[PDB]
Design a protein around this ligand. Sequence first.
Ligand SMILES: Nc1ccn([C@@H]2O[C@H](COP(=O)(O)OP(=O)(O)OP(=O)(O)O)C[C@H]2O)c(=O)n1
Lengths: 146, 97, 98, 226, 224, 97, 94, 49
Amino acid sequence: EAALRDLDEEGVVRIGAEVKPGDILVGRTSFKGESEPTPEERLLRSIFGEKARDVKDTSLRVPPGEGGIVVRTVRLRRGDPGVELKPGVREVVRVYVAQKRKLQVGDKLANRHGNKGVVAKILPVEDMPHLPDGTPVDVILNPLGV
Amino acid sequence: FGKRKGEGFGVDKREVEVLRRAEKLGLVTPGKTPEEQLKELFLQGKVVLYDGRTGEPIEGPIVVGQMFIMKLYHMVEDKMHARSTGPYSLITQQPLG
Amino acid sequence: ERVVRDSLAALYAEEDGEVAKVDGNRIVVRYEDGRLVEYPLRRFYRSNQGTALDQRPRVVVGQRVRKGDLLADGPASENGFLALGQNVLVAIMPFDGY
Amino acid sequence: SKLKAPVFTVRTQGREYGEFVLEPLERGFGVTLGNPLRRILLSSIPGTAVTSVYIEDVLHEFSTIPGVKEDVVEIILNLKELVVRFLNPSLQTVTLLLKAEGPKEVKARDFLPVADVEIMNPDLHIATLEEGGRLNMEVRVDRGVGYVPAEKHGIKDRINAIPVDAVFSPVRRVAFQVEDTRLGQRTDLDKLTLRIWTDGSVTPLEALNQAVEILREHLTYFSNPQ
Amino acid sequence: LKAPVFTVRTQGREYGEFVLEPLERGFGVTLGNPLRRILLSSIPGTAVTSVYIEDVLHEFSTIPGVKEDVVEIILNLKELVVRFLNPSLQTVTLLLKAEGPKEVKARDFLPVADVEIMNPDLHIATLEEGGRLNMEVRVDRGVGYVPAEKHGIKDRINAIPVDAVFSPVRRVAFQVEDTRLGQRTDLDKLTLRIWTDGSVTPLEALNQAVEILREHLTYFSNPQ
Amino acid sequence: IKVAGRETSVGRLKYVFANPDEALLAVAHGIVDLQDVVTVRYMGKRLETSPGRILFARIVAEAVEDEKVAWELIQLDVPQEKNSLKDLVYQAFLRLG
Amino acid sequence: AEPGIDKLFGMVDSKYRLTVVVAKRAQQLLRHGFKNTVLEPEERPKMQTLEGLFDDPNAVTWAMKELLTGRLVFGENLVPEDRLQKEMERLYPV
Amino acid sequence: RDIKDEVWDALEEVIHGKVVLLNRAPTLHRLGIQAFQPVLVEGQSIQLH
Ligand SMILES: Nc1ccn([C@@H]2O[C@H](COP(=O)(O)OP(=O)(O)OP(=O)(O)O)C[C@H]2O)c(=O)n1
């Protein structure tokens, strides 16, 4: 239930949630093939009093290094009005996910003169060069670039 | 600066050590008031700068100013990737790309 | 300014008039022609490259607007000038390797 | 011979600004004292700032409320400013409250009052509402230190509660002059003048004491060697 | 926020390494940067401050029957190290005469009361037979560094003033590297190294430095 | 300036240190700059260089932990630039590993 | 650099014969639990875990330090392969 | 979410002593690839010497 706490009854994440790598965005089930349990596996379940289940977790999770705040979901079925999809598809679900992106070490900066570089370090304001009236500079661009 | 010399603060001791140096460089005219000379550096785009790790000045006058600088579409978030093992290719059995 | 104009991303006033309502979602303007045109705001649209194409409003109720004035800022637009980045206080010096 | 304890002047202006002089100190102690205090004055001085927000009928930061011109992005960004001073010391966390409507330009004051809390910047603009525009917030401000960003503290009181970035530290700026001086006999001594600017939650002077206190506390760590 | 553990490693009387970790972000510099200043400014030691030699007018001359020049002798003399054992003491003259085929050392300085020559084998000059050396050296308690041409102290016409190497600290050097404690990873680690002349000791040198700093903290007491 | 025969400089007379620590303690206290040529006594021979040129040599000498060898490798009487430094690394490599 | 590498290159006739000796010895130790090591408990490579110091797992760090001691023999055609691979599983079991 | 802090102390243990290989864009010579002991870091970017 932990792994499901953010899904509506249909299997869609709730608009306005926080999703991170591993998280299911949409539960989906699919039927098992001619590998319906082999001996090794039928027996292992024979021990656990839970007999072979016939559907599978094919859900749509989030890929490594992505994630954000579910902003929206579109659900297109067929059997509903307006809609008809490529042959053999019952329903398609799209879920748009937002991220606020602060600047970070690795991002690339540039100015209109061809000066470009990758943020390599973020000092705390106390280390920044500053002028006598106490104000600290924002950016330190090395002169060897010019 | 004028804002300063009226708020109860004159020139600063590290601004003179810098000016000593700026003069050897040749940025400022020898024998001229601190304000006269800071003026001369300012006109050059240059100002006195203190390393915040020490309070000591930068041995020189620096170019500080206001610059238009954009964030490009190329962010580490879109580009950090690594794999122990994963999908493979039908005929070659070598990992996808 | 032109660039924001032709970029057809910022939002402007079709004829002289006055601002009826204003809102994170729409802007309705009473015109000298008695028409009540209601421009709605493309708020937080996803672009081909993922970069939020967001429209924000730049007038308040009652604001008396001549023709061709601004009503909402596109993305990368700040009162109608192309804002591709940020103005920062820049210092030009070696900094210890970084 | 050795110079002796110098004369501590103090020139507080309002609740925000201060000039703090020390005269005379041996040459080479202007900075010896003026920098490390400024470093502590920027990092380590506790303070307050908003930490989370429930807006009614809102579920995530990127939303939009009707009849309000500002988007939540800008409202969370107007609430970052809000500086809020605790009176009782052992208070760690408040929960301000708000609700306005009609054609009112909600400002920082329109927040309900609470005892042991003063809105040191009441004129701070929040949001613009028009005929029909509602609003019902529940801000949550917190004492704490430094800079702690939303992606880090995740504070949500309700469920649909947007974490916010906190500039805890109350120190808007810190400069310090060092000027030439003399105690009659000797030349090249230093007149340390320390500026401090502030929001009000703590004060230019209470900052300076708290700064020194930490500095003093740190030297204690050299007590016990191995 | 644990108690920052403090570690010492001394070779002898002239060198020690003092490491203090972990520390909140920025502090390894906010600390022993000032120490740096202080430990070079304000650690009271002693220093040869003037020298008179019997037939010697000015600094830039050669003594006859002597191998060294005048400056050479003044340089060796800049390197003498002496401790004042009586807290009251604050000045001293040192007298030394000898001649013939000898080479003088800091031992050969006529002894004095509560005045300890640390580095006695320190060579001063060599004499060839027929070579005379008869000289008086003034020595004061003081701090920091004072060029000769800027204290000028002269006890008699023809005594030369010498640059004043007070500080028993010879160099300070500190290195603040990044370090991590479990989850929190921005912490400063403050290694600090302190060279002394043996007069005072690195560890001693530090504690004084620390003391001087707290004391100035209290100079934020009685406003006006 | 030519002074009583040999050519020397004002600063090689005012300031004369018997060891390198002292010259750098002078630099510590505002007395001289690193780029000022002075007189200092390092490993016997009484030398005319700057304190900076002296600090450099200590940099090498402390890093390879062989003060004698490090003294032969550097060429001191000259500013370090791409070539001299390249030459130092090759020379270090051959004789120290 | 690798602690004491210049002397390692001195033992071998060609840098690549060091690499093979190292990597071989490195694995003699990985399968055997190090029990055949020719180090004493103070020479033991140690890593520092959060709890406290512990034997270095990296069998190559070991192999290289081991090589410096001189307590190893290197060369071609010194043993039958299978007389080693059990005399050692005898003297130090898996 | 499930990754607990002592995973990282566990990794630190893992890579002790061993090196990784770095390659940059055109391997023109033998040195578009060199080996390095890796020290872990937060943030995405690689740190080159
Ligand atoms: N088609 C390309 C384009 C780039 N590169 C790689 O990127 C390098 C190009 O960067 P430049 O700025 O053009 O070369 P630099 O040598 O870095 O120029 P500078 O001296 O001004 O730093 C060359 C090459 O390593 C490449 O291999 N193939």
